[PDB]
Design a protein around this ligand. Sequence first.
Ligand SMILES: Cc1cc2nc3c(=O)[nH]c(=O)nc-3n(C[C@H](O)[C@H](O)[C@H](O)COP(=O)(O)O)c2cc1C
Ligand SMILES: Cc1cc2nc3c(=O)[nH]c(=O)nc-3n(C[C@H](O)[C@H](O)[C@H](O)COP(=O)(O)O)c2cc1C
Ligand SMILES: O=C(O)c1cc(=O)[nH]c(=O)[nH]1
Ligand SMILES: O=C(O)c1cc(=O)[nH]c(=O)[nH]1
Lengths: 335, 335
Amino acid sequence: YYPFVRKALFQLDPERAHEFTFQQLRRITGTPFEALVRQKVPAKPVNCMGLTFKNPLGLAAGLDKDGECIDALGAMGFGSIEIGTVTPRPQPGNDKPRLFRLVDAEGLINRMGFNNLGVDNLVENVKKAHYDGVLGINIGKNKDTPVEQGKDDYLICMEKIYAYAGYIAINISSPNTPGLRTLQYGEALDDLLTAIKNKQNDLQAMHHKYVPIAVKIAPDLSEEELIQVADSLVRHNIDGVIATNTTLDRSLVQGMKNCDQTGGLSGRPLQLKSTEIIRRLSLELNGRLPIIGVGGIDSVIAAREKIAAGASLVQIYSGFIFKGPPLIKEIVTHI
Amino acid sequence: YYPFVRKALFQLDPERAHEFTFQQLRRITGTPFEALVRQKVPAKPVNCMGLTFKNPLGLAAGLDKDGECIDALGAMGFGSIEIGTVTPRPQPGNDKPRLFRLVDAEGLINRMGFNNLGVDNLVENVKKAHYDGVLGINIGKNKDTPVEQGKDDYLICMEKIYAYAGYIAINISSPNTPGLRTLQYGEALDDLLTAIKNKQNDLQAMHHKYVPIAVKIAPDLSEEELIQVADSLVRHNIDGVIATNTTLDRSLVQGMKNCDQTGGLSGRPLQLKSTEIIRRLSLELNGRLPIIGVGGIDSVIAAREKIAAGASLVQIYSGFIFKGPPLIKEIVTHI
Ligand SMILES: Cc1cc2nc3c(=O)[nH]c(=O)nc-3n(C[C@H](O)[C@H](O)[C@H](O)COP(=O)(O)O)c2cc1C
Ligand SMILES: Cc1cc2nc3c(=O)[nH]c(=O)nc-3n(C[C@H](O)[C@H](O)[C@H](O)COP(=O)(O)O)c2cc1C
Ligand SMILES: O=C(O)c1cc(=O)[nH]c(=O)[nH]1
Ligand SMILES: O=C(O)c1cc(=O)[nH]c(=O)[nH]1
């Protein structure tokens, strides 16, 4: 019963609680206790980006950064699993403490900064996985790589993951790598999208398959910036858009412990803004490429609000932490 | 632990559940026996409509339509309690069943039609109460009164309750009395507000007491309709507006048990719409009179979203049913 579990894990700091949880998931994979995490959910098959998703709910990136627990997380009923963000070379990310709970807000603040073991290790992990649903692989820039040359890092990762990903997610929305978010503005975006599409075309000829690419944007775009991002994704024929990542906003969590910690805010205090961004983006895209909606989804009605705003699929991170596997069941069953 | 209480209570049909709980509250309200439900909450004083509310959270109209349980409900920690709706003469409401639960959506559908015992009886209950918060008295039109002469039903009630109310709430937004929502449109509205306001100054010199009046609107108004209502409230110098009552919409609840029942929807599937109405209303009023926000509030963050859209105070009903007394403590403590 999850609230009991939650009380226990919440005695630990958020990063220690994840390390504890993932150590158990890594220990039960392929044992009669991959059943202690198994959850039967109804099938709600959905076509998106040319893929067939088991159901419309995915696990957002950032929980399994290295793809070590694909099978056990898939057993919980997700229609798809997004691993990463991963970078070309390993790096440690920002100093701990870099992750904080806002329990009364059912929100989180993270400044992880892409702590990961690099793309080559993720591929080895993916090779060993058995999951049948859709696998997202989310990639990003190494901290040291200069922002103007960001595209090189995305292109390196694509080459190593094309044979293994169901779809590739491009992360240019983390607030935790300096200047990374400038890649979603103007000619930087157009240059990045051009490089990436051309690689997709080259890699299609080498592997004889088309692997869709979705771009993951920030909820802190202005109305004009969002119109420009939408136009740029259409003109470059990007396969999808993941809306949204975490927010610099703090206006709903004033006066709450940790609200002043720098980083991206997620969970319930992001829900409304996420939904407003999806609805404005859907008007701009007008059906031309699909939206994956993420941001503070913590209930069936919240998932349904994002569908109404224009998304074809939804993802959760924070609501999984605060409501647990029951939320997967709720959403898949009634979305 | 309310989620276990709720499991049991949700074994009874909704109205039986209500009557069983209120039968219990009736036998303890205004006695030492109310230690059983008393909750200690911090003081968060807010000045609104010329009154001091001991905290920003009200019980919306509904739960106690006859004013039977003011002290008991006050002891759970509400900063204000709104009783009613009440009409001049008693009336039984519509035929049962008239109250339906949508558990997975955490919303309710109701077509009660103002089942109450009449204003004379409510005044006698109010006389016996000792609540130290603000008491609101919501008043409505008898089912038989022609909407043309609706104003007479409101003026009757005002005379009988003025000496006892903290503020008076004019319900012209229930969808359960035919024609009533027309009283918020164009010329009907201007006439009612003229009559109600004239009566208010009348009663102020008779009783030497300042009693603000607020109008409760529907969430299903068009932009042009909302602009007109707001303009009309300002021109007649109404003291505040309560946004919003229940909705005729069903977009978010398709495919759920009871989604096709006629009546007003409340709880989580009204939350987004209610907030958007408040935001748009606030834009119009430009601070010229305060908003009491209500509609699907079920968490401290949702309460704060309504504050950020412009509300000065908030009320709960459906969230009270679905999360219980602890929602009171969350909201008063962290709003
Ligand atoms: C601790 C943490 C780490 C995250 N890491 C990543 C990441 O590496 N890549 C990415 O694209 N998003 C990452 N995210 C963002 C989530 O994928 C998600 O988009 C965001 O938290 C909003 O969704 P939510 O409100 O359901 O949590 C991370 C989020 C958190 C809370
Ligand atoms: C069963 C029920 C009875 C209600 N009775 C009244 C009423 O008598 N007068 C009134 O103004 N609103 C009444 N309401 C509406 C609530 O006061 C509230 O405005 C609406 O339910 C939205 O808030 P909520 O989603 O938190 O419940 C009633 C609502 C329900 C569910
Ligand atoms: O790893 C991170 O810091 C990170 C990445 C991302 O996309 N979003 C976020 O909030 N944090
Ligand atoms: O009691 C009712 O019928 C009623 C009144 C009101 O204002 N709103 C509502 O949804 N129901």
